[PDB]
Write a protein that binds this ligand. Structure first.
Ligand SMILES: Brc1c(Br)c(Br)c2[nH]nnc2c1Br
Ligand SMILES: [Cl-]
Length: 333
């Protein structure tokens, strides 16, 4: 019959206990500022929905980042804004400084407190064992926070992590795909980038939660420790699941299909095949063995699960042995 419902293991009802205004972003009223308070200096990047610039706030000569939004439905703009306002001041979350419109074109833009244009993809293939653990732990602070605040990011990838490596400092950015978690809500599966899409998205299971972000985290982690970019390298969304299947095995995949009574797209009938669950040692070689430990593999194994309910929560992840020396060094400092 229909697909079996799912609920988050943690932070399940947090939005329900909030005032409506917290999560009812469609009702949020934006007070739009004047973009002529800022002067654009140089282009930092391009996105699907946005042109990103370094700018100066004339009023105080502070450097900022201006994300000029390419046109899109007002609904999506309010969602990003409301989420950013709700998470402001949270650990390792990018800080929204201002919301503005160009007076002539009327194009909306978000102004963020300045952080370096060096995304994580630019150096996550060259880090030491300790630094991978350090920066992973820092990303986990952001995810545990946003999840505790009733929000899933849905676009966790190296490009959305800004690192100031000189200052051992990190910001989770681009909340334009993030959404509020509500028990029983069915969500859009066209989210995240191919290589970081969780199996729920790939088999069209809509009642997903915070655990989505933990799959993506696992994908990042595997890429870093095995020096393999990306770890799951699909040609498209169908072949993406096949890539996962060749590592995680088809047995746990079908058990997962059956548990949630998922109707599998028939394009998958021919291509998934039958594969054993592979031991992680298979991806260890001379150029990456220094980043790989029993702790790292145990942790990774507990992130990369078909069944979203089986994956570690961000808090559970932060308590894994992999981070013991990070936690000890943090208390010291
Ligand atoms: Br580059 C960059 C920076 Br810096 C920030 Br902050 C962004 N926020 N959304 N998209 C962003 C991009 Br692309
Ligand atoms: Cl990326």
């Amino acid at each position: 019959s229909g697909p079996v419902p799912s609920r988050a293991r943690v932070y399940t009802d947090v939005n329900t206990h909030r005032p409506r205004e917290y999560w009812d972003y469609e009702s949020h009223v934006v007070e739009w500022g004047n973009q002529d308070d800022y002067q654009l200096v140089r282009k930092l990047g391009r996105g699907k929905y946005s042109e990103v610039f370094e700018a100066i706030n004339i009023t105080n000569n502070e450097k900022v980042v201006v994300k000029i939004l390419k046109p899109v439905k007002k609904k999506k703009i309010k969602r990003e804004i409301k989420i950013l306002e709700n998470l402001r001041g949270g650990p390792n979350i990018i800080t929204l400084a201002d919301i503005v419109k160009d007076p002539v074109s009327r194009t909306p833009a978000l102004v963020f407190e300045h952080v370096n244009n060096t995304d994580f993809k630019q150096l996550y293939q060259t880090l030491t064992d300790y630094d991978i653990r350090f920066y992973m732990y820092e990303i986990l602070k952001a995810l545990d926070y946003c999840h505790s605040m009733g929000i899933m990011h849905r676009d966790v990838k190296p490009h959305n992590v800004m690192i100031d490596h000189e200052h051992r400092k990190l910001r989770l950015i681009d909340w334009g795909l993030a959404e509020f978690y509500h028990p029983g809500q069915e969500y859009n599966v066209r989210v995240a980038s191919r290589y970081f899409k969780g199996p729920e998205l790939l088999v069209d299971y809509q009642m997903y939660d915070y655990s989505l972000d933990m799959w993506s985290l696992g994908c990042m982690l595997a890429s870093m420790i095995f020096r393999k970019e990306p770890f799951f390298h699909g040609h498209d969304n169908y072949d993406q699941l096949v890539r996962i299947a060749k590592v995680l095995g088809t047995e746990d995949l079908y058990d997962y299909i059956d548990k949630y009574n998922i109707e599998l797209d028939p394009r998958f009938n021919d291509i998934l095949g039958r594969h054993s669950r592979k031991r992680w040692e298979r991806f260890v070689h001379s150029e990456n063995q220094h980043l790989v430990s029993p702790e790292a593999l145990d942790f990774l194994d507990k992130l990369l699960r078909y069944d979203h309910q089986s994956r570690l929560t961000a808090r559970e992840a932060m308590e894994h042995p992999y981070f013991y020396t990070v936690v000890k060094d943090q208390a010291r400092m």
